[PDB]
Amino acid sequence: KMQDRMYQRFLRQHVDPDATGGNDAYCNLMMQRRKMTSHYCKRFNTFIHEDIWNIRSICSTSNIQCKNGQMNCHEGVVKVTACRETGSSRAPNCRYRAMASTRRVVIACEGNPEVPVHFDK
Numbered sequence: 001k002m003q004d005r006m007y008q009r010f011l012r013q014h015v016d017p018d019a020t021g022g023n024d025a026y027c028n029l030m031m032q033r034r035k036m037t038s039h040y041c042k043r044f045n046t047f048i049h050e051d052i053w054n055i056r057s058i059c060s061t062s063n064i065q066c067k068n069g070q071m072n073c074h075e076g077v078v079k080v081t082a083c084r085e086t087g088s089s090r091a092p093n094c095r096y097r098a099m100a101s102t103r104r105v106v107i108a109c110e111g112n113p114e115v116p117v118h119f120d121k
């Protein structure tokens with residue numbers, strides 16, 4: 001509905017199935033590519049390296065409570081690259097440290113069928 005646009009924002013900001021690891025150069029490139037450095041440098045962002053459909057599938061795991069108190073969150077273990085703004089970055093040269101790992105994540109899902117719409121934690 002308007003959930004699709006939330007879903008697309010999520011894909012853009014958090015899904016890169018093609019890579020699997022992350023070095024600093026990846027973050028600097030991808031943070032720009034995915035439009036998270038156009039105005040200011042987004043300080044921290046997580047990219048998930050899994051197939052869109054493996055991710056969508058998390059929405060079918062047991063419901064758990066989000067940080068905002070809603071019950072539509074779901075937890076799962078996935079390959080990520082986390083990008084942090086370095087101490088040497090400025091706008092427009094936004095600059096980052098990658099931190100690749102396989103880790104638990106929590107996503108809000110909404111809709112019918114249920115798609116991910118929001119990274120909770």
Ligand SMILES: Nc1ccn([C@H]2C[C@H](O)[C@@H](COP(=O)(O)O)O2)c(=O)n1
Pocket residue numbers: 044045046117118119120121
């Ligand atoms: N590793 C993470 C975890 C969460 N968020 C952000 C994504 C969401 O946009 C925001 C919460 O707001 P929204 O309700 O728009 O999802 O937190 C992020 O950028 N990087």
